[PDB]
C-alpha cells in the first residue's frame, strides 16, 4: 500500500528530522522551481486519516482548490510539504499528528492524535 512505501522509503522534509512529514514523488514535476512563500498554490488532491474511515477529495469542489503558501491557511504538513513540490508533480505525505491537528483535533471529524496521509497534485503557483 501507498502509506507503507512512505513509511519505509519516504523523505523525512522536516526541519527537525522528527519523521512528523514523509514524502514520496510519485511522478516528477517539470522544470526546476519550488514555490516561495506567499506564493499562491493550485492543487488537487485526496487525503484520508490513517486510522479508521474519513476520505476527502478536491474532485468534490466545484472551484479549484487554491492558497497562498507558507501562510497558515492549511495545516503545518502542506506548507512544508508543498513547498518542496514543482509544477505537475504528484507526491505522497504521510503526516503525524503534530504537523495536522495535533492532541485537540478538529472534532468530531478529525480524532486526537490522528496520523493523516494525502496524495496531492501540484497544477501551477503564481506569485501575489
Ligand atoms: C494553520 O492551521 C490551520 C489552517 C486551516 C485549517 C482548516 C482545515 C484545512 O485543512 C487542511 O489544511 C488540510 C490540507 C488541505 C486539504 C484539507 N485538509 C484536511 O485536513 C482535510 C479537511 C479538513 C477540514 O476541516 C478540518 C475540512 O473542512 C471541513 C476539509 O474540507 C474540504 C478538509 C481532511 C479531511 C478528512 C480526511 C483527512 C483530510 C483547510 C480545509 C479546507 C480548505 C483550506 O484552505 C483552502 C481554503 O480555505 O479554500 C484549509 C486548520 C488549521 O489548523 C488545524
Given at each position: 500500500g501507498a502509506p507503507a512505501t512512505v513509511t519505509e522509503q519516504g523523505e523525512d522534509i522536516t526541519s527537525?528530522?522528527?519523521?512528523?512529514?514523509?514524502?514520496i514523488v510519485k511522478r516528477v514535476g517539470n522544470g526546476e522551481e519550488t514555490p516561495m512563500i506567499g506564493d499562491k498554490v493550485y492543487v488537487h488532491y485526496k487525503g484520508?486519516?490513517?486510522?479508521?474511515?474519513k476520505f476527502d477529495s478536491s474532485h468534490d469542489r466545484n472551484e479549484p482548490f487554491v492558497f497562498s503558501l507558507g501562510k497558515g491557511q492549511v495545516?503545518?504538513?502542506?506548507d512544508i510539504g508543498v513547498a518542496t513540490m514543482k509544477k505537475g508533480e504528484i507526491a505522497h505525505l504521510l503526516i503525524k499528528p503534530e504537523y495536522a491537528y495535533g492532541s485537540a483535533?478538529?472534532?468530531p471529524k478529525i480524532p486526537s492524535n490522528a496520523t493523516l496521509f494525502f496524495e496531492i497534485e501540484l497544477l501551477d503557483f503564481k506569485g501575489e
Amino acid at each position: 500500500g501507498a502509506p507503507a512505501t512512505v513509511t519505509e522509503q519516504g523523505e523525512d522534509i522536516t526541519s527537525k528530522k522528527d519523521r512528523g512529514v514523509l514524502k514520496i514523488v510519485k511522478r516528477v514535476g517539470n522544470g526546476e522551481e519550488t514555490p516561495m512563500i506567499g506564493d499562491k498554490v493550485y492543487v488537487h488532491y485526496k487525503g484520508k486519516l490513517s486510522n479508521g474511515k474519513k476520505f476527502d477529495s478536491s474532485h468534490d469542489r466545484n472551484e479549484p482548490f487554491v492558497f497562498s503558501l507558507g501562510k497558515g491557511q492549511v495545516i503545518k504538513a502542506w506548507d512544508i510539504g508543498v513547498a518542496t513540490m514543482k509544477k505537475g508533480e504528484i507526491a505522497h505525505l504521510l503526516i503525524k499528528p503534530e504537523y495536522a491537528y495535533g492532541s485537540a483535533g478538529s472534532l468530531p471529524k478529525i480524532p486526537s492524535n490522528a496520523t493523516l496521509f494525502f496524495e496531492i497534485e501540484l497544477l501551477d503557483f503564481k506569485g501575489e
